[PDB]
Amino acid sequence: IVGGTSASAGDFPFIVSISRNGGPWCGGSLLNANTVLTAAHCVSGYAQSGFQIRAGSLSRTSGGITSSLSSVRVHPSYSGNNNDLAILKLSTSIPSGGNIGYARLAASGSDPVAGSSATVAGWGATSEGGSSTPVNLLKVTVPIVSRATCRAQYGTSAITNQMFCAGVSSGGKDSCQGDSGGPIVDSSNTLIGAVSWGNGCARPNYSGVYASVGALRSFIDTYA
């Protein structure tokens, strides 16, 4: 997260950190005791044994409850940047309570409205290009950017109806490498997306692009 602030205990109770080969990799959202939602690009094409999830901690290295993966399912139309969600099943179930909870999902057919406030969180780099990643969770609030404006930035075909955008036109606030797969919520604290892609991080005139839960909700419900 670029331009963020420290998360407090009990913020994002459903967030998980996802390590790969023992090192930082991405974020995700705990949907229920044995299921995590993340970005497809975080898991597609990699050995599932490399991954570990941690829930219930501000730290990505220590604390909370961990699990390995039992299975990985990517959206059946996932390709590159499009339809960038995956369902992970956990080898060890994680109960709610304390600083762990489960996400509430945006409805099928919903689409975040331009200009509304969203909050994104993760353990990714704090500088575009940074050499170390924070141990403790960061968060930042950014407005939704209309799909039309985002298409003017990236190209018409590049932004699909299963993506939405968020950021500030002058830059300075965004998700960044290592935040992929982690949550973006709306002003009701409903999970409306996962960190997906963008041109750099926090650049002027290049919004962050998020996989839309509302658009992909049928897939989520099938497998959650």
**Hey, which residues are catalytic here?**
41, 84, 180
Q: How far is CA 77 from CA 82, 183, 207, 208, 220, in A?
A: 8, 21, 23, 21, 13
| Residue carrying structure tokens 């969600």 | 85
Burial of 108 from C-beta contacts in 10 A (0-12 / 13-18 / 19+): middle
Which of 211, 110, 132, 142 lies closest to 178, judged by CA?
132
Strand ranges inside the chain, DSSP E:
5-6, 15-20, 23-32, 35-38, 51-55, 65-67, 69-74, 86-90, 117-122, 138-145, 163-166, 183-185, 191-197, 208-212
CA-CA-CA-CA torsion sign (118, 15, 196, 75): negative
